[PDB]
């Protein structure tokens with residue numbers, strides 16, 4: 433496992449679905465994808481409301497990311513919130529592409545990779561790492 437690769441593959445697949453071919457363990461990638469999809473299904477209207485309200489530009493993208501990610505993990509970490517994290521970063525990338533701001537995708541993948549490596553690493557590692565996520569989210573695979 434390498435976080436940069438997990439972030440890259442996740443964003444790449446979200447974007448390739450929209451016909452956007454982005455320049456940038458396989459069980460891990462597929463399991464997170466299905467976890468991500470289950471998540472956006474579970475909050476389908478709320479995701480629709482957040483897009484219709486994102487006000488995304490290159491002047492705000494970093495600040496939106498920083499404040500949302502800080503709120504998300506304010507009460508601590510769990511696998512469901514790491515799923516929401518990936519999903520949010522994916523929403524940001526997708527809205528960037530939809531608004532013709534698609535260079536922001538690179539910035540966003542970098543901020544995601546950084547946050548995982550600098551702030552999520554200890555919790556992920558102490559949980560047994562990405563194998564633990566795979567085992568947990570296997571029954572919904």
Ligand SMILES: Cc1c(Cl)c(C(=O)N(c2ccccc2)c2ccccc2)nn1-c1ccccc1C(=O)N1Cc2ccccc2C[C@H]1CN
Pocket residue numbers: 475478479482500503504505512513516517519520
């Ligand atoms: C702890 C948390 C916070 Cl803070 C947020 C949150 O405010 N947001 C958020 C970010 C920007 C605008 C509105 C909401 C969020 C949403 C999706 C992914 C990441 C962040 N969501 N969460 C959740 C993380 C895991 C599971 C559920 C939630 C959650 O509280 N929600 C899911 C969700 C999905 C899409 C749009 C809004 C929300 C808010 C609530 C729904 N009740």
